Structures are given as C-alpha cells and as structure tokens.
Design a protein around this ligand. Sequence first.
Ligand SMILES: CCCCCCCCCCCCCC(=O)SCCNC(=O)CCNC(=O)[C@H](O)C(C)(C)COP(=O)(O)OP(=O)(O)OC[C@H]1O[C@@H](n2cnc3c(N)ncnc32)[C@H](O)[C@@H]1OP(=O)(O)O
Ligand SMILES: Cc1nn(C)c(C)c1CCOc1cc(F)ccc1-c1ccc2n[nH]c(CN(C)C)c2c1
Ligand SMILES: [Mg+2]
Length: 382
Amino acid sequence: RSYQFWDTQPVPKLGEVVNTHGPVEPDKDNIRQEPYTLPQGFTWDALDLGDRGVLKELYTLLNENYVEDDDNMFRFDYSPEFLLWALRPPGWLPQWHCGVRVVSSRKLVGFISAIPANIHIYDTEKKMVEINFLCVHKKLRSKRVAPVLIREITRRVHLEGIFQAVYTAGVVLPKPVGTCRYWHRSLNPRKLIEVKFSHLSRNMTMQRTMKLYRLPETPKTAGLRPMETKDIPVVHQLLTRYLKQFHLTPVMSQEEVEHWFYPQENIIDTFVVENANGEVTDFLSFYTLPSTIMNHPTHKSLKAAYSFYNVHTQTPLLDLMSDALVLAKMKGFDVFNALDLMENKTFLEKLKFGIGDGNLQYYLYNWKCPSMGAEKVGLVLQ
Ligand SMILES: CCCCCCCCCCCCCC(=O)SCCNC(=O)CCNC(=O)[C@H](O)C(C)(C)COP(=O)(O)OP(=O)(O)OC[C@H]1O[C@@H](n2cnc3c(N)ncnc32)[C@H](O)[C@@H]1OP(=O)(O)O
Ligand SMILES: Cc1nn(C)c(C)c1CCOc1cc(F)ccc1-c1ccc2n[nH]c(CN(C)C)c2c1
Ligand SMILES: [Mg+2]
C-alpha cells in the first residue's frame, strides 16, 4: 500500500532491493530542541519508574492496552518488577521513558521507550537503541498518536548522538530485516484447551494429549544448576563466542550480562551446566511473561515462559531445550514459547512445539542492509 508516516522515514521501502550496507541518511549535527506537539488536551511526561505509584500507572496502562494475540483472546501482562528489568538496564536514561498524560485528569494514556544497546549487524558494530513498549490507550486508537510518540523518542535519542535503532513488531512496516515465526510447547494441556489457547485434536483423546506432552519430573543433563554471581564472566564469554555465527546480535558488556541473565524469581531464569571438572560449558535462559485471558470467567491468567538465549558447547541443544521445558513445567508454567530464530528450528518439531499464527518482524531504523533468514537473527527483545 502507501505508509503515510513510514514513507517519510529513513528506512528502505517495502520491495526495495538492498545490496549495500550503511545509513539511510547522515548523522545530524543540529537536532530539533522542542518536543513534537500532541493533540489538544494531552501532554508529555517522563515517567520515573523508581516511583512505585508511577510504575504502577505504567503497569495498568500496559495491562489494559498492550499487545493482544491475533484472535483478541490474550493480552500481555508484564509485571511491575519485570518492567523495571526491561526498562532500567545499564545506561537507561530518564528522558527515554516517554509517557503521554491527559492534562486535566493526569490519566496515563500513551508510552514509548528506548534503552541503549550495542548491535552487531553483518560486519558493523554500532551503538543503537532498542525501541519497545509503544502503547496508545484503546480509546485513543487510530488518531495518529503513534507517529508522534515515534518522532518524539527519535528526537530524544538523536540528542544523545545515536542515529540507528532496532525494534520488533507483529505488523509489516517498511522494511523487515528478518521475519520470525513464533511456536508454542504445551506444558499444561488441560488448562490450554479450557481457555482455548489450544484445541483438542479430533484424532486424540484428552488422555492421549496429556500423555503426549508429559515431561520428566527433573531435568536430564548432569550438573545443571541456577546461574550464580561467580558464573557472570563465563556466561559472558560463552554468549559472546556463540553469537558470532549470527548476523544481527547484541554485544553485551559483563555488566549487561549480569543484568540480563542473573536470576530474578518470576522475571528471568538462567541455568548453567557445570561439568565433572567444575567448568561451565552451556546455559539456557527464559523469561516470565503471563497473558491476561480476556473476559474469561474462570481462569484469569496464562503462565507463559519465553525462550531467551540458549548457548551450547558440550550439551546438545536438543537436550538443553528439553531441560528448559522440564524446568518451566516444574515452576508452574502452562506453555513455553519460542521463535524460529538462531538454531531454534533444529529442535522445535522434535520437542513437540506447534507453530503459531503470526510473525514477529525485526527492523532497523536508518540502516540499509540485505535481509536475512530467521536462522541468522540472534537478538531477542522482551
Ligand atoms: C535513531 C532513533 C530512532 C528511534 C525510533 C525507531 C522506530 C521505532 C518504531 C516503533 C517500534 C515499536 C516497537 C513496539 O513496541 S512493538 C509493540 C507495539 N504495541 C502494541 O501493539 C500495543 C497495542 N497497540 C497499540 O497500542 C497501538 O495500536 C499502536 C501504538 C501500536 C499503534 O497506534 P494506533 O493503532 O492508534 O495507530 P495510529 O493511528 O496512532 O498510527 C498509525 C501509524 O502507526 C503505524 N504503526 C502501527 N503499529 C506500529 C508499530 N507496532 N510500530 C511502528 N509503527 C506502527 C502504522 O503502520 C501507521 O503508520 P503509517 O502506516 O501511516 O505509515
Ligand atoms: C500468548 C500470547 N500472548 N500474546 C499477547 C501474544 C501476542 C501471544 C502469542 C505469542 O507471541 C510471541 C511468542 C514468542 F515466542 C515470542 C514473541 C511473541 C510476540 C508476538 C508479537 C509481539 N508484539 N510485541 C511483542 C513484544 N516485544 C517482543 C516487542 C510481541 C511478542
Ligand atoms: Mg492514535
């Protein structure tokens, strides 16, 4: 079609053949000082997420108005402490927690965020931001408020000297650098079929389906244990080495590996394999993100775990992923979710995952390069 806003932006056109690598336009050496204008009656407010009352306003905005699945049955329900993990990693800036309030009532009705990240894209490493948590209240939809939040976070990032971004979305925009399908692995099929996340096969009874997805009570790989503070350097080494094989990846410092992987109950889990010699040789990780089961009288919340970064050097990836499913089931999850990026297609079908119904598209702002297969994408955003 045409894209009234995105056709104005430094991104390649949909259908554009890209053979080159580099910025769409130059670094700016004068940047707009004034904020963009919202519609009348709304104002900007930078949200101090260290204030418990303001963090709870953001939690309510997203709980009521954030991403739903393609059937409008489940809505993400990020916890307040999860939002602090995703929004205050090393190098976060207060002006990059960008809220929109109704002037009279003060109600929070919009948000968008940026966090810094060093990104490796083919043969270039650049300091970028990751854009996430763009949300407009349901009563304000389709009034072109989202382009104002996108231009305003772009301005605030340009003031800090950054001219590229990475972001994901379930919608097609000019122009995906990679396209990933999500898959799911049932852990509690009775509840998944009750809430109609899943359906009972015409060729399987409930008994048989419970048996098909049943898992061992403890993981198979010897020496698996939670990551501890003494493991931060070796997790950093393992991840850095492992990610070199992909074409779009983060470059994390040792402090960022501590932030993104050190376990926090009900937010992030990381388990390392420590061999007979005391050496850590592998790790698996997954984050906790429930979904509200919209308008349902009985079960209110779907407990979902999401595959994060999984690094294998001595344990087969298939066994590490089996370990992850066992652990998730022990921790009371209903479903484990994963995308088809990195080496994930080597295990999805073998471990009984089923393919979902939509795409998570990956995008770069102000960076032209060839698109890549899902197997070459090595970056996961919450
Ligand atoms: C150098 C620094 C650069 C930094 C910035 C880099 C770019 C960052 C970009 C943002 C990365 C976000 C990453 C995440 O957080 S992905 C998660 C996005 N959030 C949700 O899906 C939550 C539920 N939905 C909503 O809250 C609203 O429907 C949103 C806010 C998504 C759109 O609000 P609304 O439905 O009321 O629409 P509008 O009338 O105001 O605006 C319509 C225009 O908006 C374009 N649109 C729709 N959805 C998206 C989307 N997910 N990314 C980018 N553009 C989007 C659309 O094609 C149209 O443009 P054009 O077709 O006319 O051209
Ligand atoms: C369950 C369920 N609850 N909901 C609300 C959806 C979209 C599902 C389907 C599974 O979706 C997934 C399953 C995966 F294994 C990985 C990712 C997603 C997914 C899909 C669309 C998204 N849009 N914004 C984000 C947030 N962030 C990455 C920018 C999304 C995350
Ligand atoms: Mg709008």
